C-alpha cells in the first residue's frame, strides 16, 4: 500500500473497500479502536468530521465528532490554525463521514486535501492521514449505541426536516 499524503509513513489503520477506490476506507470496529485508544502511543490526535447537515449531527452524532458540512467552515477550523501533534513523532488523523458512506464525505475529504497541497510546498501536508468511515452513520449507530449522542438517528430525508435540508443548501457554495 502507498504511503501517506506526505508521503512520510505508511498509513496506520486497516481498510477496507469503498465507493471511492482511491479514498481510505475504515470501519465502524476502527474507528471505536481510535476512540478507545488502542492508537494513543501514536496518535496524538484526531477529528471525526461529520459532513452532514446540522439537523443530521443534531439528531445523533459520534461522540467527540465535529460537524463541518460547509466548506468554508471545514477550511477555516481546519486550516486556519491547523491541529497539531505534541510531539513531532505522533500522527494527525481526519475521518471524514456522512449518511451512506456516499459522497458527502469524500467530497470534503478531496476539498480538504485540495487545499492543504494549496497551501504547502509538495509534498508536505498538514492532515497527510485521512479516511472516511465505511458505511457512515447509518452503519455505525447500530454497531455502536453508546458511542453517540444523542442515541438516535436523523436521516438527511427525515420527513418532518425538509425545510431544513432546503435552508442548508442556500448556504454551500455550489449546487
Ligand atoms: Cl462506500
Ligand atoms: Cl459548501
Redesign the pocket.
Known sequence: MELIGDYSKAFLLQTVDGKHQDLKYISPETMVALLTGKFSNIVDKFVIVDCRYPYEYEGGHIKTAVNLP???DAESFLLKSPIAPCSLDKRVILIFHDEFSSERGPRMCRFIRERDRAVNDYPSLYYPEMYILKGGYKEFFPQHPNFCEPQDYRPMNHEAFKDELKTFRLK??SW
Open positions: 460547509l466548506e468554508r454551500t457554495r
